[PDB]
Amino acid sequence: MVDAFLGTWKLVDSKNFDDYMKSLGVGFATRQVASMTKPTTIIEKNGDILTLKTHSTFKNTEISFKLGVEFDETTADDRKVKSIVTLDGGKLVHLQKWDGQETTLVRELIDGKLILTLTHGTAVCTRTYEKEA
Numbered sequence: 001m002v003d004a005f006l007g008t009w010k011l012v013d014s015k016n017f018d019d020y021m022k023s024l025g026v027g028f029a030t031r032q033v034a035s036m037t038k039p040t041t042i043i044e045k046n047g048d049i050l051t052l053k054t055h056s057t058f059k060n061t062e063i064s065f066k067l068g069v070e071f072d073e074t075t076a077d078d079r080k081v082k083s084i085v086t087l088d089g090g091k092l093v094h095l096q097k098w099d100g101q102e103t104t105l106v107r108e109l110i111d112g113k114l115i116l117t118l119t120h121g122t123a124v125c126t127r128t129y130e131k132e133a
């Protein structure tokens with residue numbers, strides 16, 4: 001079910017990421033670097049466990065999780081959140097909860113590209129990733 005998401009992906013398009021970061025309270029200087037960074041996302045599976053790495057020149061993250069099982073996460077911007085990832089309509093849906101807030105990170109495969117939609121408050125950011133061979 002998750003296999004078409006697996007592999008190494010590089011950022012090729014971003015829309016409204018500054019809006020998303022600002023909604024989360026990220027400071028100007030961090031927004032400014034993040035607007036010029038092109039991360040690599042690596043998604044791998046070992047049995048039921050998925051590991052999602054995000055690498056860049058500015059910040060790295062790594063999470064491991066089982067679909068449908070809550071996990072603690074410390075985000076790139078240092079939020080301590082309660083997270084869960086599932087599959088819904090073929091999309092990989094990641095929900096983060098903290099301080100009564102929520103944000104969703106939804107990944108959809110369209111014509112072999114990985115589209116990441118980030119929503120917080122009213123802000124909606126769309127980032128497009130293409131697969132590395």
Ligand SMILES: CC/C=C\C/C=C\C/C=C\C/C=C\C/C=C\CCCC(=O)O
Pocket residue numbers: 011021024026030033034037039041054055056058059060061075076077116127
């Ligand atoms: C490790 C993330 C990689 C590059 C972006 C650069 C800096 C992160 C700092 C602030 C961004 C704020 C929010 C973090 C939450 C989600 C961003 C995920 C973006 C993505 O995977 O393309």
